[PDB]
């Protein structure tokens, strides 16, 4: 092979598991030895293209915050709370709307004080529910609001005891835009195990945090690559609410190439 | 192949990086082609002994808490505070000691309010610090206490700035016993780096969190293999102070080989 050695390093520099890494080159060389002619230059673009088609239809990416309720659940320490912040500061100080807050984060000591004083800065309300009875109660209390940002308890979502618990408190229906927050820092094998666990709970988009601490993004590719949905936002720093962006398939696939 | 193919299978299962398996096998295959009888029954013995002889010696592991000042720094959301927390209750409640607290986490919003309303529970003193002088003072104020648990801000240590702010704010002398906090969920490649950026600052042990949340421990081995210090602590849940533990080189390996 020739300009392929060049592309074999690319797929290697990225995360991308083996199954894929190898399968991509298969696809490249096939539709290449028959299609046109590869250059030392156009290898990547052709490379990026093929990859991009392994993800979900680009329409499944960049779904804006539309529905009323905006919930966020995920791994412990990835960016759940600090993100709702970044989002809220947008749905108010930018798209000018009636903003509210609700939290399910009980389990941890003084865990609430955080968002508690996060709202105190956005002059928005806040409710803390320990039972769905209270959560729905909370939904009425904000009825007149455009967007109600929900927060959740950080939990090791492997043990099933916790996906039940989540579906217990929150209802999940018509007016809810769920988001699964994951850190681009997590190992693929890990993420894949929990993603399968949220199979029993609806989810609109992906939120991958800490892309700036990452070293590669292939671990993120593999997750999306084998999923129905794409990614909503992607935090990229601590600074609130600046450090946070949004991306599209090919655009992502473009950060991916190490 | 032979009873060795088995060892070939175990290695696969662990997150161990290729080069290491290749080498563990050359060792295994060597000291068995001119040695004992790798009964597929006692093959798992040497495969661990070999691996074990690759991490720093037992003496570099399990360094108990002695110094008057205990410092924990590390990746974002890894589990520094909950850990600094588990570590404090244990020293107090179980080892009967005069505990004290100190924070440097001025960055994270509400970070203080929580550690304070927690230190209050453990009924212990806490002093916030924005400068090196302030810290040194508190560090000198608590001079009468046995142990002083210092918590730090979770900045992304890829910007040498913060690795400097750390050494600046926190001096580092005989009195201190620092602990680098990394999570068992991170990819090896990410840790491979962030461990170099910390070369300047001295580190006594290592704290790997969320072992109850990861799938394999290969990455944690990979990091240790090419290190000069072992692990002090490991955490396995969110319950304080229960979910915390200690391991030995051979003990850690027994966790890799399932
Ligand atoms: N570099 C970086 N750090 C981030 C990003 N998002 C969150 N962090 C950091 O990760 C840490 C934890 O964030 P936080 O929002 O509290 O996480 P969480 O998911 O709510 N934690 P929990 O599940 O415990 O409630 C903070 O120190 C924060 O600065 C990001 O995009 N980049
Ligand atoms: N499953 C599990 N979760 C853990 C463990 N240690 C910490 N966590 C979780 O990880 C999250 C972050 O913990 P925290 O103490 O805020 O981490 P930190 O390093 O102080 N965060 P920051 O750098 O943002 O200040 C919490 O949701 C906590 O429950 C552990 O051993 N197992
Ligand atoms: Mg949170
Ligand atoms: Mg903390």
């Amino acid at each position: 092979p020739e300009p392929l050695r060049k592309a074999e390093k690319l797929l290697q520099e990225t995360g991308i598991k083996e199954s894929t890494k190898t399968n991509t080159l298969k696809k490249l060389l096939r539709f290449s030895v028959e299609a046109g002619g590869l250059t030392e230059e156009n290898v990547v673009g052709k490379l990026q293209e093929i990859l991009c088609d392994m993800l979900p239809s680009a329409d499944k990416w960049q779904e804006p915050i539309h529905s009323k309720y905006i919930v966020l659940f995920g791994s412990t320490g990835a960016g759940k709370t600090t993100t709702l912040a970044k989002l809220a500061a947008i749905s108010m100080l930018e798209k000018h709307k009636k903003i509210a807050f609700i939290t399910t984060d009980t389990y941890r000591i003084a865990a609430v004080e955080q968002l508690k004083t996060y709202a105190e800065l956005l002059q928005a309300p806040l409710e803390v529910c320990y039972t769905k009875e209270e959560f729905q109660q909370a939904k009425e209390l904000f009825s007149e609001y455009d967007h109600v940002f929900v927060d959740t308890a950080g939990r090791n979502f492997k043990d099933p005891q916790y996906i039940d618990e989540l579906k217990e408190t929150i209802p999940f229906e018509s007016s809810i835009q769920s988001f699964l927050v994951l850190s681009a820092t997590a190992k693929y094998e890990d993420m894949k195990h929990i993603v399968k666990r949220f199979s029993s709970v609806p989810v609109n988009q992906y939120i991958f945090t800490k892309i700036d601490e990452t070293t590669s993004l292939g671990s993120v590719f593999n997750i999306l690559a084998e999923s129905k949905i794409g990614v909503g936002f992607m935090t990229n720093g601590q600074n609130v609410p600046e450090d946070i962006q949004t991306v599209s398939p090919l655009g992502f696939v473009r950060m991916l190439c190490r």
Side-chain angles (χ1 to χ4, degrees), chain A:
Chain A
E2 318 309 318
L4 272 54
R5 289 181 302 88
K6 178 180 181 63
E8 179 158 52
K9 288 192 55 185
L10 252 296
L11 302 181
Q12 279 180 48
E13 277 183 51
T14 75
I16 317 305
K17 59 179 169 185
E18 210 45 46
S19 176
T20 310
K21 179 171 300 184
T22 227
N23 229 308
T24 299
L25 296 162
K26 182 203 190 73
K27 277 206 270 289
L28 177 60
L29 187 73
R30 166 172 164 295
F31 212 74
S32 176
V33 72
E34 60 188 61
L38 300 179
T39 302
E40 32 84 64
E41 180 183 63
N42 55 45
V43 282
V44 184
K46 220 302 147 296
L47 184 55
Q48 309 186 301
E49 185 175 309
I50 302 184
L51 298 163
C52 192
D53 299 81
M54 293 179 73
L55 296 317
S57 51
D59 76 280
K60 221 70 68 179
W61 292 48
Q62 289 177 295
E63 188 192 327
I65 294 177
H66 234 175
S67 182
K68 292 181 64 177
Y69 307 106
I70 310 302
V71 188
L72 302 199
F73 35 62
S75 285
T76 59
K80 274 178 267 48
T81 288
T82 299
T83 298
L84 268 181
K86 301 185 180 313
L87 261 60
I90 300 297
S91 299
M92 180 172 264
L93 330 181
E94 287 217 296
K95 303 194 174 305
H96 301 294
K97 292 197 169 186
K98 313 175 183 181
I99 297 302
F101 281 117
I102 313 175
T103 309
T104 316
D105 205 306
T106 288
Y107 201 66
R108 199 225 302 159
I109 43 184
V112 178
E113 267 302 296
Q114 207 189 315
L115 187 58
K116 198 289 156 54
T117 86
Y118 245 103
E120 297 181 303
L121 311 194
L122 253 50
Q123 296 172 59
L126 188 161
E127 285 292 302
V128 193
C129 338
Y130 305 58
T131 61
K132 79 183 198 70
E133 290 53 46
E134 306 177 61
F135 189 69
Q136 201 64 57
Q137 280 175 41
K139 267 200 180 188
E140 286 189 62
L141 195 59
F142 296 121
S143 60
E144 324 292 62
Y145 286 75
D146 301 313
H147 296 158
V148 184
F149 290 114
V150 196
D151 189 34
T152 71
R155 296 283 203 175
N156 167 33
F157 289 105
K158 179 149 65 182
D159 178 308
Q161 206 260 57
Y162 299 122
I163 272 58
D164 291 304
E165 182 175 304
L166 174 64
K167 287 189 290 184
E168 300 296 284
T169 299
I170 295 186
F172 291 117
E173 99 302 298
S174 307
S175 62
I176 288 178
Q177 267 192 301
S178 300
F179 284 61
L180 178 68
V181 178
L182 304 180
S183 159
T185 289
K187 297 180 280 187
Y188 168 60
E189 215 65 52
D190 290 343
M191 298 184 278
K192 177 171 172 291
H193 273 167
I194 65 178
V195 158
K196 234 63 68 185
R197 247 40 193 277
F198 273 46
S199 167
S200 43
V201 315
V203 183
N204 295 51
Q205 289 272 268
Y206 267 118
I207 305 180
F208 282 102
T209 67
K210 308 175 167 186
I211 67 182
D212 65 304
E213 287 180 306
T214 207
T215 218
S216 104
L217 271 73
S219 52
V220 180
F221 176 107
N222 292 295
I223 285 294
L224 289 169
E226 53 185 62
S227 296
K228 276 63 264 291
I229 71 173
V231 302
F233 315 71
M234 289 181 16
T235 65
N236 44 267
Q238 323 187 61
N239 291 166
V240 187
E242 290 78 305
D243 296 333
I244 174 182
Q245 72 170 300
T246 173
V247 301
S248 56
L250 163 51
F252 163 51
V253 181
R254 260 180 275 187
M255 291 183 264
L256 204 171
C257 292
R258 259 282 187 155

